[PDB]
Amino acid sequence: MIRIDATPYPYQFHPRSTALVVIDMQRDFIEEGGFGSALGNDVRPLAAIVPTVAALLQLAREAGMLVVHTRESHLPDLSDCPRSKRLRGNPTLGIGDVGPMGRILVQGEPGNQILPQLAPVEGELVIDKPGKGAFYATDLHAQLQERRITHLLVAGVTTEVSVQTSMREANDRGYECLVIEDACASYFPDFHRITLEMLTAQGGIVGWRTPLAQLQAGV
Amino acid sequence: MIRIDATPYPYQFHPRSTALVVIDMQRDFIEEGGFGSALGNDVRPLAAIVPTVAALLQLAREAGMLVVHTRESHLPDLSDCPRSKRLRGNPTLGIGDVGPMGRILVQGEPGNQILPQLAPVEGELVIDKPGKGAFYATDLHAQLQERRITHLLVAGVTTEVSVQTSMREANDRGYECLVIEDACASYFPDFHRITLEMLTAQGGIVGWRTPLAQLQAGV
């Protein structure tokens, strides 16, 4: 079992009982021409972690861990998109409308694809999720139980939305979760660090956090 | 049909399709010597909201809305308590250990009870949940769908753990959620404030928030 330095105390895991979960690293959220920048978000902090996420993905692949990618996406007919989600924020361009990289948040559109630097390969799970939490309305929990996974390494975007939602759901379902702090990012510096602090408060209420360099030291 | 001034924009609901959800207002969180104290917290800040939660409960009862209470709790044999949750951190006492109000976080124990001043009455729904999120491993989604509930008024403790986890689950499931800002509290004032900001960021990404006085004005 590999033991690495973490907050709030060291985290130990066996690589073959562990999955890396890379959350929502999608072109529309991260690329300068994309829908995220069009809404006036500063995508630079999300772009900034891509080399770190790629290094974590390489570590996981070399260590023989299960790799799980998630995409926030809906069926082209929006049959899995609740009306509340479509109407939220009174948007000019909403879910299913044509944005700069195709229909917004729709399966098969260029904007919906994982960045090519972090693209899934054969033997990796890819989860299309209709919400922020990777476990809601997906078979992720079943797929991890079939593979006897107990431990999750968590990366991706954005820290305070899909990453924290997915880690809080994983914690509730009995997973031991380690969030890789420099392999996550937010549009808001107001939210990134304090989220990671929340997750590991009270002796690890949701789980653990560490930088990629501490994980690399262990393998 | 009832329109409330709220952040990030006004919230509209109908009592016939709205529930009040009161989260984890238990002696295990609010009274010294239970689960919250066992985690090393000073539980004293949560008591300050109990009169505001009581006024919110009265308002919902007088409006004839469905009321849902949640209790974080485990079966006495701990068969619904993941090993990860039991072994997390270094608590003074662990789940199921005997504290001054009985077995910590166990169903039927004095310290696990909802505060008498906030107790359920005949015709309210009471959800025992094994995780922080009110939807995981409960029938809450089915119970609301059977009553055609679309809107949730949300209150309780703690803001950054059970409240925000439950609200994020409810958002993913298509509910429209209004958190009553002064009917929530945290052990950590900064986590309370920033959680409320995250929930309504980006045009209402999780939902809405407003103080009790704005709700009272609308009814």
Author numbering:
A (entry chain A), B (entry chain B): 1 to 219
Share the article's original sentences:
Biuret hydrolase (BiuH) hydrolyzes biuret to allophanate and is part of the Isochorismatase-like hydrolase (IHL) protein family within the cysteine hydrolase superfamily. TrtA is a member of the isochorismatase-like hydrolase (IHL) protein family, similarly to BiuH, and has a catalytic efficiency (kcat/KM) of 6 x 105 M−1s−1, a KM for triuret of 20 μM, and exquisite substrate specificity. TrtA and BiuH are members of the IHL protein family that possess the catalytic triad comprised of a cysteine, aspartate, and lysine residue. Interestingly, the active sites of TrtA and BiuH are almost identical in sequence, and so it was hypothesized that triuret is the substrate for TrtA, funneling into biuret metabolism.
However, the inactive mutant C162S was able to produce large cocrystals with biuret. The cocrystal containing biuret, at a concentration of 30 mM biuret, only occupied one of four active sites in the unit cell. Biuret is coordinated by a subset of the residues that coordinate triuret, and it binds in a noncatalytic fashion. The dihedral angle for biuret is fairly planar in this structure and binds in the same place where triuret is planar as well. The closed conformation is observed in all of the chains of the triuret cocrystal as well as for a single chain in the biuret cocrystal, which has biuret bound. The other chains in the biuret cocrystal that do not have biuret bound, as well as the apo WT crystal, are in the open conformation. Biuret shows very low activity and is a very weak inhibitor of TrtA. Inhibition data suggests that biuret is a competitive inhibitor. The biuret cocrystallized with TrtA binding in a noncatalytic fashion suggesting that the glutamine residue has a strong role in binding the substrate and stabilizing the preattack conformation as biuret is fairly planar in this structure.
